Tab-separated table of N, CA and C in Angstrom:
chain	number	residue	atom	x	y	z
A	1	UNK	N	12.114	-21.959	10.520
A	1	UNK	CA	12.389	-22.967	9.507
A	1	UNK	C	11.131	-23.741	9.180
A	2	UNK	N	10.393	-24.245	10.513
A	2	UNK	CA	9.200	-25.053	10.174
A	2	UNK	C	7.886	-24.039	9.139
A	3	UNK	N	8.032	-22.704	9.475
A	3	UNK	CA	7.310	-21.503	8.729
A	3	UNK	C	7.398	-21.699	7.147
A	4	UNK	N	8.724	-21.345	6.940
A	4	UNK	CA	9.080	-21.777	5.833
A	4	UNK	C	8.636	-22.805	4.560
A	5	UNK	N	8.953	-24.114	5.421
A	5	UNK	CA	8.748	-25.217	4.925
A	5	UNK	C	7.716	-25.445	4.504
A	6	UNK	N	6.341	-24.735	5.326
A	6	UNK	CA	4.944	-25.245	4.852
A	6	UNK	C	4.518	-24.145	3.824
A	7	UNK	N	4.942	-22.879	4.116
A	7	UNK	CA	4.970	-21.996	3.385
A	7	UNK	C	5.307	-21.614	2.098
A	8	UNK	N	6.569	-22.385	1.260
A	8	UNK	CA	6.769	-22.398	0.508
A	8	UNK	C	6.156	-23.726	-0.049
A	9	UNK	N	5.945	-24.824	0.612
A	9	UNK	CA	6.399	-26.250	-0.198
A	9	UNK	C	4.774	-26.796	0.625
A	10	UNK	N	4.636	-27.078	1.580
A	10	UNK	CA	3.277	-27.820	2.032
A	10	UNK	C	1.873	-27.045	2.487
A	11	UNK	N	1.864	-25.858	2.653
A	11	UNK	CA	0.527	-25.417	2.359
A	11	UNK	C	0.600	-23.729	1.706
A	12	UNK	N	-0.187	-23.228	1.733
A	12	UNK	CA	-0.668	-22.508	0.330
A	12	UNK	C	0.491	-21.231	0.701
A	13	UNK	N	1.182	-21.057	-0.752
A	13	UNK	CA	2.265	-19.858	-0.653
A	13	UNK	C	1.911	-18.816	-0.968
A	14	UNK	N	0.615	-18.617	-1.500
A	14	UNK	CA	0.320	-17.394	-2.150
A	14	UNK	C	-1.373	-17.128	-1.297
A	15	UNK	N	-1.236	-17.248	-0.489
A	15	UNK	CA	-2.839	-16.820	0.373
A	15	UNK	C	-3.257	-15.585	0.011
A	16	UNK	N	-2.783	-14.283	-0.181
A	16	UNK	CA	-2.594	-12.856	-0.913
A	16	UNK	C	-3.664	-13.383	-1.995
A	17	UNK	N	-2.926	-13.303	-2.934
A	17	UNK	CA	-2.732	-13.762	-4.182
A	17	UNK	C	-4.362	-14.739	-4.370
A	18	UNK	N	-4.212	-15.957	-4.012
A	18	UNK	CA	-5.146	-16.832	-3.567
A	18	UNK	C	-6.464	-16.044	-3.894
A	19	UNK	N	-6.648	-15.697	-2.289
A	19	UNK	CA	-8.124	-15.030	-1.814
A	19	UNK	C	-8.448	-13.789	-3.216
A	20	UNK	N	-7.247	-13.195	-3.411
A	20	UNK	CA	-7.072	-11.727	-4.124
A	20	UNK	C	-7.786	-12.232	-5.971
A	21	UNK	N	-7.340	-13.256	-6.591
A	21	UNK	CA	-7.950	-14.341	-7.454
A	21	UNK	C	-9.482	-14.863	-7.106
A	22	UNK	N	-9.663	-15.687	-6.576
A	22	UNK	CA	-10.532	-16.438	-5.662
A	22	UNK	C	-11.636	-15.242	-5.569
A	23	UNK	N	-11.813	-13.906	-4.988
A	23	UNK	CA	-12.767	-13.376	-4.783
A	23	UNK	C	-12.851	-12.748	-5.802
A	24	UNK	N	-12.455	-12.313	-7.541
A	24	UNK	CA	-12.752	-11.988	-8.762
A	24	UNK	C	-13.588	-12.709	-9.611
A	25	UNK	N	-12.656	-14.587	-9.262
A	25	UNK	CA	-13.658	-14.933	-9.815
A	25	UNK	C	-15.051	-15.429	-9.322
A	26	UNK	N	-15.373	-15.686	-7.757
A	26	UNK	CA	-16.614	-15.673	-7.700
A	26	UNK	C	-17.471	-14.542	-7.860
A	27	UNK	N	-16.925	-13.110	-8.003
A	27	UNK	CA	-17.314	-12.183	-8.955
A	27	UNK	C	-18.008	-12.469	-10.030
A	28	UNK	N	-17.360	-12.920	-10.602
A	28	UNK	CA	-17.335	-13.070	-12.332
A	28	UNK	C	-18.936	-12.982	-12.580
A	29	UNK	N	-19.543	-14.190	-12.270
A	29	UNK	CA	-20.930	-14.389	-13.013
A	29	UNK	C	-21.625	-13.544	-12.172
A	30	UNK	N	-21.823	-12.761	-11.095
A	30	UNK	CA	-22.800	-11.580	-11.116
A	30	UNK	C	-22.792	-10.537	-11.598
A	31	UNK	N	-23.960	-10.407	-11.935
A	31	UNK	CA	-23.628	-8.278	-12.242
A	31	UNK	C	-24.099	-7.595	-11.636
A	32	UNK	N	-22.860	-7.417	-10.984
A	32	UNK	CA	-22.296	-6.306	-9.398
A	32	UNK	C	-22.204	-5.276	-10.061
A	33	UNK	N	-23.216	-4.178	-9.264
A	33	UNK	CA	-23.171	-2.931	-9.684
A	33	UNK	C	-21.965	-2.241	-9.437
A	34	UNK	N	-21.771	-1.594	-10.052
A	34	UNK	CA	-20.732	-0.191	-10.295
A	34	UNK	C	-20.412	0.584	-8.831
A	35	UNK	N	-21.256	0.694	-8.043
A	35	UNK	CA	-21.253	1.388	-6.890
A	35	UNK	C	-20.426	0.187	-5.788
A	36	UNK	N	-20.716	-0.607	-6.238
A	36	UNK	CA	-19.793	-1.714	-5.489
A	36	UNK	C	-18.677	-2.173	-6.012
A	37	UNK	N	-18.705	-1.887	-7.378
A	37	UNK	CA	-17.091	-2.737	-7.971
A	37	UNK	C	-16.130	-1.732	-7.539
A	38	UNK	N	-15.919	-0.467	-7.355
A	38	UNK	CA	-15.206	0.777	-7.078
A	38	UNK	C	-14.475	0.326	-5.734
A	39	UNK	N	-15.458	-0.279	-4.584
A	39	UNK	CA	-15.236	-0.289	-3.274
A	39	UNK	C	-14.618	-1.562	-3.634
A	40	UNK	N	-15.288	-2.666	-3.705
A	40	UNK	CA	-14.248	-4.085	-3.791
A	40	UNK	C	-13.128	-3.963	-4.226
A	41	UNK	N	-12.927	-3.323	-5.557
A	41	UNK	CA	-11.749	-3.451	-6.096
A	41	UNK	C	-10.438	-2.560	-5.169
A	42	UNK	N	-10.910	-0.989	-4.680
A	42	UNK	CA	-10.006	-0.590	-4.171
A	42	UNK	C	-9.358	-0.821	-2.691
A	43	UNK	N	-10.727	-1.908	-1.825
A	43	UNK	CA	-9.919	-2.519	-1.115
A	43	UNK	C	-9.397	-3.896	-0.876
A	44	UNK	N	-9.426	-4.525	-2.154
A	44	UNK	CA	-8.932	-5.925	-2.649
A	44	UNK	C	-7.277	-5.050	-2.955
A	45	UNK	N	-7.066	-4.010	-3.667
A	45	UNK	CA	-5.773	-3.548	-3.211
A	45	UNK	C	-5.463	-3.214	-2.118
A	46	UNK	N	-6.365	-2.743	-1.464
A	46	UNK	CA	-5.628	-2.376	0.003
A	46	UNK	C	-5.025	-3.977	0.917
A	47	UNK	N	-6.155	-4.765	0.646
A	47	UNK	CA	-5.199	-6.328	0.842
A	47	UNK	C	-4.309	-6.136	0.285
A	48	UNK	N	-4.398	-6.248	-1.271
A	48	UNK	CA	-2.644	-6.474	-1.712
A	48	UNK	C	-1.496	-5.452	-1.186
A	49	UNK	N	-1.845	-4.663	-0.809
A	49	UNK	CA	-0.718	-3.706	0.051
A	49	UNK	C	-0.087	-4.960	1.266
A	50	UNK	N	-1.108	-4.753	1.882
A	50	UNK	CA	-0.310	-5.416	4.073
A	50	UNK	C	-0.062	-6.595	3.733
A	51	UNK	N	0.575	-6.429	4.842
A	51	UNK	CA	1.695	-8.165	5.835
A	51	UNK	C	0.245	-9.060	5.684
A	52	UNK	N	0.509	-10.110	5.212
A	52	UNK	CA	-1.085	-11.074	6.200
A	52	UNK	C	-0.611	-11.417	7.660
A	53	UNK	N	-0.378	-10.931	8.165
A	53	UNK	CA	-0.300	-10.748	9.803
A	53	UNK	C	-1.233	-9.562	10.083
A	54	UNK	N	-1.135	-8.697	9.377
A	54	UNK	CA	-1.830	-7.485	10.031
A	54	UNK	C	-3.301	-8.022	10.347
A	55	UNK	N	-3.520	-7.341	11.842
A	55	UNK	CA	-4.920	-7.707	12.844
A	55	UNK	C	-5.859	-6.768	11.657
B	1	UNK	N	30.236	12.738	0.904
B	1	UNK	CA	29.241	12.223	2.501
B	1	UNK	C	27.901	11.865	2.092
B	2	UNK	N	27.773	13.366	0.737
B	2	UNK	CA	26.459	13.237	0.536
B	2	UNK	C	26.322	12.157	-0.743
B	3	UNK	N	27.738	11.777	-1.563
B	3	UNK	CA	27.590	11.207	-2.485
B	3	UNK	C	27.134	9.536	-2.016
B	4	UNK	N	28.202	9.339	-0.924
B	4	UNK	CA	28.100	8.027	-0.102
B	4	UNK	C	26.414	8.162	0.851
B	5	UNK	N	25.916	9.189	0.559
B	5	UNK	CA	24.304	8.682	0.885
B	5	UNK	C	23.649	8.550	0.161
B	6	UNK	N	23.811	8.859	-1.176
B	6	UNK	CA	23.089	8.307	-2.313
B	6	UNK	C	23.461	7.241	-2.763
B	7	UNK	N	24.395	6.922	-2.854
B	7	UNK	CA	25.339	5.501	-3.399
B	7	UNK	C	24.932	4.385	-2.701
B	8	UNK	N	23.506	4.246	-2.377
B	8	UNK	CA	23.149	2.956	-1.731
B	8	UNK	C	22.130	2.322	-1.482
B	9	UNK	N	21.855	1.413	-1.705
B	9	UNK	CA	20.511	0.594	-2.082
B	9	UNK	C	19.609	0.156	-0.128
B	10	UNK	N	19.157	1.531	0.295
B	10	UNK	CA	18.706	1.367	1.429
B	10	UNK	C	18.507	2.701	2.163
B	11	UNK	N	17.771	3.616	0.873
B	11	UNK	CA	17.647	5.121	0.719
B	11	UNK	C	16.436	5.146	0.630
B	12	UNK	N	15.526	6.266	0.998
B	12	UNK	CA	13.781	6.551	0.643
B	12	UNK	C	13.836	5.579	-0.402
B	13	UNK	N	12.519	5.085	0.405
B	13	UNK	CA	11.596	4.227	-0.144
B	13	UNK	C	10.970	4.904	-1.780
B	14	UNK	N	10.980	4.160	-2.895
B	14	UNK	CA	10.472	4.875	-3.999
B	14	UNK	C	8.791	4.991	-3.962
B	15	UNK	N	8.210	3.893	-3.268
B	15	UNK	CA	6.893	3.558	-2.891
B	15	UNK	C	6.268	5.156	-2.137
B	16	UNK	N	7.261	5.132	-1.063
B	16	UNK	CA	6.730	6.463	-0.301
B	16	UNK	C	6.926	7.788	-1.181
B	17	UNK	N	8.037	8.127	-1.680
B	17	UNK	CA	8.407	8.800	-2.678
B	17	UNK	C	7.261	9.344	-3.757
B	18	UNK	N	6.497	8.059	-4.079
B	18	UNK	CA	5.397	8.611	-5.032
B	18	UNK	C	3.890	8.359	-4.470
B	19	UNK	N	3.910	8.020	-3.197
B	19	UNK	CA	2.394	8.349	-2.566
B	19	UNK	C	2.848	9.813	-1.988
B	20	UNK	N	3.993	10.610	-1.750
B	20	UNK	CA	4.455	11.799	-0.954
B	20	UNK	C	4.177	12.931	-1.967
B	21	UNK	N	4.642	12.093	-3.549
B	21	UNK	CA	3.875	13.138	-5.005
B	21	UNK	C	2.637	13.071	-5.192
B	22	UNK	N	2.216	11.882	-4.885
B	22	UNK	CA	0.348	11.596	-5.447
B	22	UNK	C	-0.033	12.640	-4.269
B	23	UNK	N	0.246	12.135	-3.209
B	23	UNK	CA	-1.039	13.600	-2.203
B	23	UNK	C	-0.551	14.951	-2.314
B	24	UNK	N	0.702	15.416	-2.785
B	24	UNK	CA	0.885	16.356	-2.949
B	24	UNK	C	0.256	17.056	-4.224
B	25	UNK	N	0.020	16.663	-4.961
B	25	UNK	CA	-0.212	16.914	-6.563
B	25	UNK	C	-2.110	16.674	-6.119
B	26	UNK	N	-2.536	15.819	-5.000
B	26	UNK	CA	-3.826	15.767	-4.605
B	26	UNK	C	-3.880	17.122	-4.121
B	27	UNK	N	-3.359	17.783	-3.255
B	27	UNK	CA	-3.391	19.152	-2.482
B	27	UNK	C	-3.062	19.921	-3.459
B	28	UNK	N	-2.441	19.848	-4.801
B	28	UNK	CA	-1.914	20.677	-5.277
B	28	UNK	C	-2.983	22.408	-5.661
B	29	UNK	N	-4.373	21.659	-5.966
B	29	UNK	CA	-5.154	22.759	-6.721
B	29	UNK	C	-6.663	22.664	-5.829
B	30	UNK	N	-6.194	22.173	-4.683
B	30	UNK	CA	-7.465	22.620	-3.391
B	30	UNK	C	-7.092	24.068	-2.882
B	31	UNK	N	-8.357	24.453	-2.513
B	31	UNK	CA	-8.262	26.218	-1.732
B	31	UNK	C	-8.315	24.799	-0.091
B	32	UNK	N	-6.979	25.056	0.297
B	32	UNK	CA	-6.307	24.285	1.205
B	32	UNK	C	-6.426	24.764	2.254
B	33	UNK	N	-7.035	24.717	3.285
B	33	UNK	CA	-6.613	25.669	5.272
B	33	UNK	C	-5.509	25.088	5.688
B	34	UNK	N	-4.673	26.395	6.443
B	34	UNK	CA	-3.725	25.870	7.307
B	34	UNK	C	-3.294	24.748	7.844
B	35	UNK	N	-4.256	24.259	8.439
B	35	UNK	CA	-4.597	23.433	9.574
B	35	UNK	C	-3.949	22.373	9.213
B	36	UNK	N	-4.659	21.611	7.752
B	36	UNK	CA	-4.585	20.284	6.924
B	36	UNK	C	-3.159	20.853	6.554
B	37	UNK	N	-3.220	21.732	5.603
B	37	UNK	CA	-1.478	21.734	5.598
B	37	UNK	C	-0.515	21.267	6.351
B	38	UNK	N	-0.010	22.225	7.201
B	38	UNK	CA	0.887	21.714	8.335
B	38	UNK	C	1.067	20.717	8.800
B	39	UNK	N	-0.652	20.187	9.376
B	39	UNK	CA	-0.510	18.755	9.455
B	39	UNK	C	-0.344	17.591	8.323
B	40	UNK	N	-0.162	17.652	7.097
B	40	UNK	CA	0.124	16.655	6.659
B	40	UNK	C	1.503	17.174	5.724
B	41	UNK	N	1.794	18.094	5.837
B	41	UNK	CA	3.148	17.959	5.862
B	41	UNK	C	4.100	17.378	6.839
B	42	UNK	N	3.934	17.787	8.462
B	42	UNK	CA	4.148	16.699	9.236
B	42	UNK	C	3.940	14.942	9.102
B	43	UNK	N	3.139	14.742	8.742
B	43	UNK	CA	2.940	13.362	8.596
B	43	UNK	C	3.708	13.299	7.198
B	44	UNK	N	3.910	14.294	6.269
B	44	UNK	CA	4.112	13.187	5.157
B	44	UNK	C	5.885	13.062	5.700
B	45	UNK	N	6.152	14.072	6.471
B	45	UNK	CA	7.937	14.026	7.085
B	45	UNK	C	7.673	12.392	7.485
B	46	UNK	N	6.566	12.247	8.410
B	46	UNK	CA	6.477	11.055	9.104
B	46	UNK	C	6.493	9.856	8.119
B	47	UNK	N	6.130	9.806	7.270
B	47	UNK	CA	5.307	9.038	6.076
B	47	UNK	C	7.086	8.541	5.395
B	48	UNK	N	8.090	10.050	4.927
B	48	UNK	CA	9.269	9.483	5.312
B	48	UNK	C	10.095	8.548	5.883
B	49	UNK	N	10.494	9.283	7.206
B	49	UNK	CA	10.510	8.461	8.333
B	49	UNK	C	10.660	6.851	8.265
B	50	UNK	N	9.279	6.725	8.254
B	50	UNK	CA	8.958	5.425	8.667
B	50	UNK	C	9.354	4.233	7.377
B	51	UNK	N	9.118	2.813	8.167
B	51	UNK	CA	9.512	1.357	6.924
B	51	UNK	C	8.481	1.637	6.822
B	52	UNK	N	8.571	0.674	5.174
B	52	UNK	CA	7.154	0.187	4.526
B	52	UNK	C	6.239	-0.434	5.195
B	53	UNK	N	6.279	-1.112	6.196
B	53	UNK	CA	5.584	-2.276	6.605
B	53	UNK	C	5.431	-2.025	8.100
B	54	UNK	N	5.355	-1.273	8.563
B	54	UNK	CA	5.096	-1.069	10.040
B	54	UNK	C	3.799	-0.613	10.457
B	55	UNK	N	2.200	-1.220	10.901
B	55	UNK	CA	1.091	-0.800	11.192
B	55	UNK	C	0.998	0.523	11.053
């Protein structure tokens, strides 16, 4: 219940999401080569896949 | 028996369902060895099997 509570309502509900945002746009203003946007991007999905529990 | 196993919202995963087509359709037009075969036909039984969310 106490999980919950902070989870939805007192601290951040979308940490996923968050970081998954958050690390695009400090992206934004470099120009990150191609050989690297391939790798970031496909494991910025592999975050969005798992539990955030997973070790 | 078999209708009442389809008739229910807690049947293969559709998620697994189409990563079980994506690697298959990946293997589809490789000169493939045994070896990898078998074994990932085993796993993809496994890949079945298993919840979404389990390490």
């Amino acid at each position: 219940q106490l999980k919950i509570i902070k989870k939805e309502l007192g601290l951040e509900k979308d940490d996923k999401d968050a970081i998954e945002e958050k690390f695009r746009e400090r992206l934004k203003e470099l120009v990150v080569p191609k050989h690297v946007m391939d790798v970031v991007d496909e494991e910025l999905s592999k975050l969005g896949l798992l539990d955030n529990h997973s070790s």
